[PDB]
């Protein structure tokens, strides 16, 4: 049965850890996968999680099986670091929440659903983009086209061909969007860009879909979720999948969101007890601990606090090993200006290195990047900065 | 997009628990779905793995993504639980385990695995099965055919009816078989009847997959993995769905496991492979919390010790609760007579009540059980007894 099934290509992020792991060269560096580290290198759990973890640990009575969406409250939370404290569409109860495991399973419920309950044929992600959009979709059985986006001469976004590319997708077609930090680039439309690409959205009969996972790294938790925010106030129905990964570094724990938003409650009752059936026919319903974890500290003020530093924190530890990249780099050679890496949201910068250079990087100095060039930021320390410069400048 | 969503039907059991919890009676019983409770009436924690739990609360330092395939420890503890300590299939390398979201993940992404690896069309399962059976392999895109099982009449395993039936199963079908505490019946097969089964569906080409959801709830860890075991001694290939749900009491964590066995080590390697790419495209990785409780603590000598007894203390319970479900019927004047009942495994009796009578067992007296007659033996209690045993008279 089994006889003649082909291996499948490894995940070109999930890869590299392999790889990244079986390496025995002592000075490894990896910038590949997005995790975050911090100043001596290492991924930490949040003092906040410990905290909320250890209440759980004595307060917990039962590990009864959740609902099928979820945590109540851990939605309700959502739907508020989403579209905000008294959004309408919280008051006109127009959203419902499912908590799922991961942005990723947020994704493929979203699919799942769409691809079972809605004559949505196919799904538009940008070029270029997270690896894993293609996968999800296809994996329901929607076709991917991908939209223009980044400018790599300029290093920019380039809102023409973006809009010129998007011409072609008909109505009731999905086009996904990234909530903030665009993966790989870190390029982000700005607030008017937003809302000049909602205003097309409604005009085209494009159902949006906002892939939500890095919340609180860009600016600010409020400040990331203008765009959404913005497509929110003129569209009736949209879908958010949103990631606690890595604003909660809660990687392992897969806790994420599925957000369903309709003209009305009827509406999107109706419609969300369809995606219901389809979490029920996938993975039933979700881990607890997680999710229980986002859910204290979000309904607890000194966590709250506790936590909105760690972030704020995180957020900025970035932002220093971004300009201290560009400086470095230049401070120990570097032909080419990377300046374009300080206006880059997030913890990945796009390079612009070669795949040639990249895979020279690895094998030869051991430093891993994707073979997009897409680096790792948060996996810059000040002790790892000259090492990897170095690498860096002896490929250009 | 969402104004012609049609409301989905209710899970004939999660949907029981929303009526459960919506009424507010008084002494309502809730006997639908499977949650073992204990005297006094509360589904615990149990302390075994509070136990792993500060463990790991204490000894935590990362939160970094797991592998797709989860845990190792995990997954090796799982193959010898399954299989042996000691078995070949180990030995010879020919077995690999991802931990997955609950028994459920693992349906789901071995079906997947199947309906795009494979030229599997159909898949068979039990007449009467567990309701989401069908779900689950439905949206894989697999077809599900059904093979006769329960004497009604008798309160038996209808073995040649069985047999008559999957003669109709073609070389290459997949055969679903429930591990021990066959659900809903709790009627599971002789072990000559399992290696019947086994040399027969060697010779007819089905590719046999385990769902075994309640290892330790029949007779014992290693002899409920007994129908399994002389399945893998005659079959190149095959596939366990295991659950960590029941026996650990970790519900809602979602702690379960995929297993694949193929002829030998470089066979399953590949196939492995399509499996994890299938995982990839779903949730992505599974979630710790659940998984490293049931790996710490099937690790540890003591903590397993504890945890195996607080295992048999519930299988006893049960068993308990069964003797005196009939006895107090009987000095009730119940019509029929139930000694069936005391020969039936795990939390459940497919009690022959009608759909009239379970409905009726509801509005009037608050019981809650299953259409299909399924009662939860688990949620009975000294004290709910009397009030339960008398419903039952007054509808029969
Ligand atoms: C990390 C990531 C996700 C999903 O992450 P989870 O680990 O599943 O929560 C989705 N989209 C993007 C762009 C991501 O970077
Ligand atoms: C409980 C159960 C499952 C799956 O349970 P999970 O909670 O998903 O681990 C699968 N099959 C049967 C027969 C079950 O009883």
Redesign the pocket.
Known sequence: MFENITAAPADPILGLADLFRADERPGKINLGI?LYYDETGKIPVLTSVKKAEQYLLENETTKLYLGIDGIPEFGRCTQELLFGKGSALINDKRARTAQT???????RVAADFLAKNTSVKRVWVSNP??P??KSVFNSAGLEVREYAYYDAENHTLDFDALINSLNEAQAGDVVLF?GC???PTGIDPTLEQWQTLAQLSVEKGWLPLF????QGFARGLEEDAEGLRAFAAMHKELIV??????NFGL?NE???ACTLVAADSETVDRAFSQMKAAIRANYSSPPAHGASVVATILSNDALRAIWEQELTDMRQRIQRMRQLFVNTLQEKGANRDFSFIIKQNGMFSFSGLTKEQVLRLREEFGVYAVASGRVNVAGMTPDNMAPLCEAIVAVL
Chains 1, 2 share one sequence.
């Open positions: 997005g495991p991961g942005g990723s399973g947020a994704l983009s997270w894993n959009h990234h930090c665009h993966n892939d939500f996972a890095y999948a949103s990631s606690y990964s890595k990687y897969r806790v994420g």
